[PDB]
Design a protein around this nucleic acid. Sequence first.
RNA 1: GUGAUUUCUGCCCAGUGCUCUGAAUGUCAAAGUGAAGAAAUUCAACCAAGCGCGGGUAAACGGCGGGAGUAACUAUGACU
Lengths: 182, 88, 488, 208, 100, 69
Amino acid sequence: LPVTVEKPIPVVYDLGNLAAFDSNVLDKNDLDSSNARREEKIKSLTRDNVQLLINQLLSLPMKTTTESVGGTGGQSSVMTLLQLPDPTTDLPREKPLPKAKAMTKWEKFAAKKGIKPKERAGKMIYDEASGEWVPKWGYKGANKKLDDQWLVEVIDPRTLNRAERKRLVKKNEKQQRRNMKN
Amino acid sequence: SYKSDQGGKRLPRIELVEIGPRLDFKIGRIHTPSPDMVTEAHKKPKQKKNVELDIMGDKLGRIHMGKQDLGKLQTRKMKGLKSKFDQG
Amino acid sequence: STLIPPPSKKQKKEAQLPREVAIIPKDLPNVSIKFQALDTGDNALRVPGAISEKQLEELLNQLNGTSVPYTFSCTIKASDPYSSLIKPQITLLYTPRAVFKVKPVTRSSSAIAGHGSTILCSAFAPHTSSRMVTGAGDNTARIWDCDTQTPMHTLKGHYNWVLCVSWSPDGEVIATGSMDNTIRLWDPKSGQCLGDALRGHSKWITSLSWEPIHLVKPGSKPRLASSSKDGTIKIWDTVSRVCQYTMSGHTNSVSCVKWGGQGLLYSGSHDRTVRVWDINSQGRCINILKSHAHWVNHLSLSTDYALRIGAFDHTGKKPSTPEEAQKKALENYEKICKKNGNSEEMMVTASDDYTMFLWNPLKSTKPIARMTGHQKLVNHVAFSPDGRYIVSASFDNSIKLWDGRDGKFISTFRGHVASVYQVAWSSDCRLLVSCSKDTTLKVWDVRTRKLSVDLPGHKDEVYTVDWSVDGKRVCSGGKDKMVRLWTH
Amino acid sequence: RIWNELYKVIDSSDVVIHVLDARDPLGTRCKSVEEYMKKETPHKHLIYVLNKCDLVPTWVAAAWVKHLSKERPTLAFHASITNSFGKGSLIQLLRQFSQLHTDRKQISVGFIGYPNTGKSSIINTLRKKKVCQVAPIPGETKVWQYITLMKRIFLIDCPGIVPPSSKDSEEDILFRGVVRVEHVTHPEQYIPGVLKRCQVKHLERTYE
Amino acid sequence: KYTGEGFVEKFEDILKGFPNINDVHPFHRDLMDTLYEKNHYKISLAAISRAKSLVEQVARDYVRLLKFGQSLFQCKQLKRAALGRMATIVKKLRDPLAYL
Amino acid sequence: VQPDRRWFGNTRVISQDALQHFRSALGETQKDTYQVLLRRNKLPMSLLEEKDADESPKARILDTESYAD
RNA sequence: GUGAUUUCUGCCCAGUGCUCUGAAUGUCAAAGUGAAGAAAUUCAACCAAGCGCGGGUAAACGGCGGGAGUAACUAUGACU
Ligand SMILES: Nc1nc2c(ncn2[C@@H]2O[C@H](COP(=O)(O)OP(=O)(O)OP(=O)(O)O)[C@@H](O)[C@H]2O)c(=O)[nH]1
Ligand SMILES: [Mg+2]
């Protein structure tokens, strides 16, 4: 009947994992592999621990809300949740921490002088005749326009233009590979 | 968990039931972590004096006035406070 | 979105220690407590300690000689129900509960399609929550089977908007006051035009009211009462369809009509004056009350909840004969009203001067109190079903809760961001729903003066709100031409 | 012309110090602008400095610091170049204010108050040389002046203001030294005020 | 500035001419109360007093704006803006000025 | 100005839980005379004001009897 | 350099700021000598220079929140 129970040495708690740590005195000659009254001791020395743990868990701060069903996040008004503290035991990671700091020689050139990054606002430009907003790259990009022009006004010049673009693309990829090898 | 009547509706009296499994364990061989790996596997990912964040937002700062001892500061010796010029 | 500031470092390092489990230590160092009621009873010197707050109830049952439920409180200082010693000889105050629990109304059922214009008025049947009536911006009203969320029995027969619907306090007929100054009656189960359109007013109908069942001649049916923008107040008997006798006291438009427990109609008008008509005196006003500075909107009585159902209690039963019906209705009215043994029904007024007045028109012609504190016009006011709480809504986004016996101030319910158009109580007088000019509906828990749930789902303004009688459904509707039912 | 220097100094200054007169501070207080700084510029700090503290007893000065320290910090000062009092307390508090704004590349602090309270003398004692002109006549400093110390904190002094209170006297402005007494026309009609303010015992010992 | 002074001076003569119904004598007070409706009497004069401050603030602001103009066009437009806001403040006093 | 779906998108929503939290945390200030403000954390401030009054300001008398009445 | 006299112990019980009769066992890359057990692993001893030890200096470059805790070893003072 009592919802409480006393133990000499105080149990340590990890509410961030829902874990208890008891360090009281056991009896070597109670849990031996053949003692008849073995379960009736295990199940109780653990039940008092669970009692202390539920006592500790049912006294944390609760977090209510006023939302309703459909709420894209989670809980609704009819759910109280316990705000668990953080764990304390140093349990090891599984992969090291992520760090990869290469300057790729562009972050060195641009930083020796004062080239700041760009604002990254939008992807559209304004075509003048025609009167549309014609993505700079992303649909019939302004680049791929000398390709389907109906006359170029000087070997086919449009194919030479394609080749000259491809050369810079491949040079950029090679520069990237070199930087990553450095 | 059942009603208690010794702790109100808040704290109940709990009971356990054994479901499974039920195992014993004896120790065999081990391979322990090297010091370098132990110091490299417990790392917090890294993600302010007199500066506090209040509730409501409100970054605030303390200013910590010193101790001010006016046992110094000899007050100026004006002529009217000198009893030597008393008109009696 | 805007975020609550995150917890600090020292607060995180604090939240890990062991923390504060109560034990209920012994605990009977006995304190002598004074069991005293609210109305007059102080019943008698018992000295218990820390015992079960549900055993105090049984103490009072066995003492007052009934074994009923009782709610408790102490020291009307913060007036809060071992919990009397954890924070700090001591008295005890109690009220009757009349236990009939109403779970909140959280979810949202289907958004029922319907009319082709906005929805102006809505009402729930007094006998079952399975049917419900809505008059809308077209020239029709509609009946909805809430059981299956489906339509039924659209009632064509007007040729202008329907501005008020009422379901008779016996569940026999429905009345639709419209824009064209006709007034029509309809049968629920059939949907046929029960006669022709009553008429006699020169401008539109503002409000309707019915004869309370506990005064109707057994073997007969209740009567009507109709307000109109012209200024007339007309009576109607629903068997002969004849205008019994009119009343023409006011001068401006008249807003609302009531019907008391002793046969006294009350009427507030745009003439800044509340009049008290009479039916035993053929309809000559016996009292005029002029206290407001601007005009008056939505007067409200102390028993206008009991007077609305008429022997159909929260358990959905029915009467078979007017004999048993009249006894049930009298019992209802006495259960709601008899808190001193007399006919102490009060009245509350809501006017465009930001202030409400607390009348007892029987005992005197002076207001008992002047309830004030709003900052814009007060559009709606209501009494609790048990009559000891007044709730008021206003165009300044707030709602205010007053002590309904003398007129004090209790609390404010903030949370709307636009005007509050009207409010509504639940059956057990513990919740309160409200609709607003913005989308959302809000449910408030009166027992703690907080916000329970906030339910969106409409798309434009919301004009009506009606909780059922057994608390099973809440109906709403407005500018988006959809009906909406909310359940638990 | 000077109320256009006041708002300019308040605009440019990160932290303001309001200087008072230890003889009568409540008259030289000039509230009237604290309501402004609170309404329009809450991110500015506004501490008090009570100088000329060697002209009043010690219990008087302590009482005044106490009764003023229930609104703002209010340090207590005495501004001479050789023999001062409070210089360390002001320096090691400007250092705190500078550490708090550790990403602003500098802080500016501005001195405001009535005329002839010692705004320039405080700068002079802090820096330990004659940097701005001082003089017993009220209207000495006329425009604002920047002065650097510690490479990260600037000081700005400005001319002294008198709020245009439409009440409270014509002869109180005289005894809160604002007017150059050479210009008042009949200066003998004000002497009853001197006899009222001072003591007979003190006045008997200076003339004699 | 000149038009600002004009409106302000037309309003001062009204605010200093009428007899200040409060604190004159409880006989004339009550007589004027039954004659001119003390509420409306005070309200119209408070309307005029409020206009007197609004006009002054408009005049004060648009001078400061003009002293940063860079062309005849922009300066002229600021002038017209100021005079128009003044006229629109005044045109709302059609009822109080007719009662008074 | 190019067309875009931002511009016609909400930018600064807030919820009822945050509203109630902040509103309850404006009657627990306890100003310290030695703390100075550094930043103010832009918030919707016209929704968290309005402590309760007891006045109910005067009604407009001009809507019933204008002046010609 | 300063500019008669009189005032001038100034924000520095600041020793990594402008110098060294003085130092140390606080640490200490890599190197080298000792132990376990088959062996990776773990641990003992020796240690170059800077950083804790300290004297000293007055118009004095520029550099700075004070007082405790005396590391429940730190990844350039991660703190309290
Ligand atoms: N007795 C005494 N006199 C002082 C003290 N400090 C300044 N004074 C005198 O007060 C006058 C102050 O002149 P300023 O320092 O220029 O004061 P101010 O008018 O506010 O400063 P400005 O901005 O230049 O106008 C000087 O004549 C000083 O001699 C003080 O601490 N004690
Ligand atoms: Mg001066």
